[PDB]
Point group: C3
Chain length 179, copies 3
């Protein structure tokens, strides 16, 4: 079909969303850049090594632990495809630093909608479990859900990845009901 400038990929923990984003990037023929958001315990180091092992010499790596929107604005061009490592771990970095999450979320969705070069956003679903016991985890769950809603609105295409299988949900007609 026609080229898009923005894809959002939403999936659970260890859903295959990362691998799916990587394959969509490697099929594009663009210059490939990974926008890394993960801060390196041994659980994170293992993830970062797994991902790095499974990326060949075509890939450039730029770190953006906090300044993700600014990084996207600076690095995006038609000749390149940027893949955001994890929207989730970027949100996690802001939360734990003390940041108010609503402005950076609003700014990222604004940036997504105005992109001049293609970007794939990889993000977690974290909303389909029980209400968390502590306040900070409830605020994170809330913000990640708000963030994915804003990004889905801004982005040209949205895919859900379940057990390694991609399903497109945008573009697509919203269901209509007559009562």
């Amino acid at each position: 079909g026609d080229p898009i400038k923005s894809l959002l990929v939403v999936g659970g923990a260890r859903s295959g969303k990362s691998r799916f984003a990587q394959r969509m990037a490697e099929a594009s023929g663009r210059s490939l850049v990974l926008i890394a958001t993960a801060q390196p315990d041994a659980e994170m180091a293992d993830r970062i090594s797994r991902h790095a092992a499974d990326r060949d010499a075509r890939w450039t790596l730029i770190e953006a632990f906090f300044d993700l929107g600014q990084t996207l604005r600076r690095e995006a061009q038609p000749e390149r495809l940027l893949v955001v490592d994890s929207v989730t771990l970027w949100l996690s970095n802001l939360l734990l630093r003390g940041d108010d999450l609503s402005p950076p979320i609003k700014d990222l969705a604004r940036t997504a909608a105005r992109l001049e070069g293609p970007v794939i956003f990889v993000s977690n679903e974290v909303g389909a479990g029980i209400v968390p016991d502590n306040a900070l985890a409830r605020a994170f769950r809330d913000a990640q859900g708000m963030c994915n809603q804003r990004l889905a609105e801004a982005c040209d295409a949205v895919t859900l990845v379940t057990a390694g299988i991609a399903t497109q949900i945008k573009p697509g007609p919203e269901p209509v009901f007559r009562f």
Copy 2:
């Protein structure tokens, strides 16, 4: 084809509440909100079934704010949830006018450590299955995007 009932399921801050609200405001009907200036507003923490029967008319379009919190209530009071959940599903088929039920998916994380969360997780799943079966239509809302799963033929696999 017109429908009498819609179940809307999503995660926390999925966009499902605003999806259900917006489906009413597209309907041409007399929009009403149930809680557990074109809108009325009613409370039903413990009667929901009984309530919906009373407050539904052919011209009205009710919206249940959370199935999720009504469940919580019966849970807290120590109620056997199997009969009430069965009742509300029967109710959902026989309303005097249309109804949009808004409900959470809560089963797609790990098994909770405390008994009450485990019991609520279980009831919420059974409740969504029973409302999905009774309702004419069911939509999954994911990151603010609605996908229809009913009506539509369920897949069949042969062995």
Copy 3:
């Protein structure tokens, strides 16, 4: 191949109390095969014993039951036959049994995924999505969540068909062409 042609393998994925077991049961009862439940659930407590009771009560006398708390791949390889249909109770509870015994999870996950390629008869795998909540507090819960996600990826790749069950309603996601994008 047409969609109604016999398949060898189906993965059914859903959250807790999603209808996934009933979906598997319905697909099995529509076949003409000898129906065998491969039970992985241990009656560790009253809550598990209740779930076991509900599953036993749901199944008419057409069903045979074979326990495989730990040795699931070996059980499938031994018990699969062209005239039988094997239904795996819960992949999730098999993994939970391995997690608490202390086994490394990756080798038996990969063995199960390869096994699903070359059974002598058809199989349905019922498994939980456990990835769509918040990151767990403890290390064992985090290791479990990660292994279950990896397991479902491997089973979905290996199986002829994959369905997501949500509020008791099945949606097919395999077979089906993957989305394609140009950038």
